[PDB]
Amino acid sequence: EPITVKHALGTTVIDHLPQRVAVLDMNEADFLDQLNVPIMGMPKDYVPHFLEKYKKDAQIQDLGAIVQPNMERIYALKPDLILMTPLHVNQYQELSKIAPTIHYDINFNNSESNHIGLVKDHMMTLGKIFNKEDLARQKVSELDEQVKQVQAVTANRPERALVVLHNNGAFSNFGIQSRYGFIFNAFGVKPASGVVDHGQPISSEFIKKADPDILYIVDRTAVMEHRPNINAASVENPLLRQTKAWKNGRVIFVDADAWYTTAASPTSLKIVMEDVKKGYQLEH
């Protein structure tokens, strides 16, 4: 019963159970970890904390950088399956030369529609390929329950939120049509701005007209420069500090590994939803 995967970049047929798997980003690595599927190679420049055991495991080949893994190292690893994503589209043809190559059908650029369904679909596809259908279906059920939990928290709440990305002292807003669109669409968070605009840098005019009751701050610099996450005392930005969210203590410094490095896999979405719920939590 060979599986045929018709994805965004072509069609991949898998006739045998793959045994030497290369994953090209950390979302994919989280899927296979969650399915208890061994990984033969992955990039290791930005391994999230919840995949820490993989950075240290010398039996897992380091393929280099997430954004552009080392094609020479991949070819040498002789994988029998490569998992890649929209980040690697420019390498798909070259990867498919080396091994059957699956593309994760997901939209990292604009997640406003069906983000959760696309994550679930991928999980079920991987469960079929690796003969882990029952465990795949369980993880899908868990994701569904988690989504119901955050939707129960956001339901009928009046608060409106911004998702803002910190980068080297600069802050930019990510709205309903951005990479964080799914926060609004999937989980029922109400956006503090609706106007469609890298993100929109925080200006005085913007924050005046889109003054959030809740603020989720994604610290990109903590990930990229491997530095600790900023906290309330790091924030110099006066526009952010005069918002209702800041005054009322509804500022969540999110788990940047789950929100920035991944954001499209079972462990990461679980964490994202816990962070979202903290934004609504009025008491300890």
Ligand X SMILES: C[C@@H]1ON(CCc2c[nH]cn2)C(=O)[C@H]1NC(=O)c1cccc(O)c1O
Name residues contacting ligand X, limited to 174-193 (CB under 6 A): 179
**Among 66, 162, 258, 272, which residue sits at the site for ligand X (rule: CB under 6 A)?**
66
Per CB under 6 A, 9 contacts ligand X: no
In the bound state with ligand X, the residue whose beta carbon lies nearer, of 135 and 223, is 223
Q: How many residues does the chain have?
A: 284
Cβ-in-10-Å burial (0-12, 13-18, 19+) of 118 comes to middle
Q: What is the pairing mode between strands 214-219 and 160-167?
A: parallel
Q: Is 109 in the site for ligand X (CB under 6 A)?
A: yes
Residue 103 makes contact with ligand X by CB under 6 A = no
Residue 111 backbone class (left: φ over 0; alpha: ψ -120 to 50; beta: rest):
alpha
CB-based contact 32:145 (threshold 8 Å)? no
Breaks in the chain follow which residues, C to N over 2.5 Å? 197
Chain residues 11-30 in contact with ligand X, contact rule CB under 6 A: 25
Q: Which of 108, 128, 138, 237 binds ligand X (CB under 6 A)?
A: 108
Pairing of strands 170-174, 200-201: antiparallel
Our finding on whether 67 is near ligand X (CB under 6 A) is: yes
Is-contact 230 217, C-beta < 8 A? yes
Rounded distance, CA 209 to CA 264, Å? 31
Binding mask 206-245 for ligand X (x = CB under 6 A): -----------------x----------------------
Shortest CB 66 distance to ligand X, Å? 4
Binding string, residues 246-275; x marks residues near ligand X by CB under 6 A: --------------xx--------------
Interface contacts to ligand X, rule CB under 6 A: 25, 46, 66-67, 87, 108-109, 179, 223, 260-261
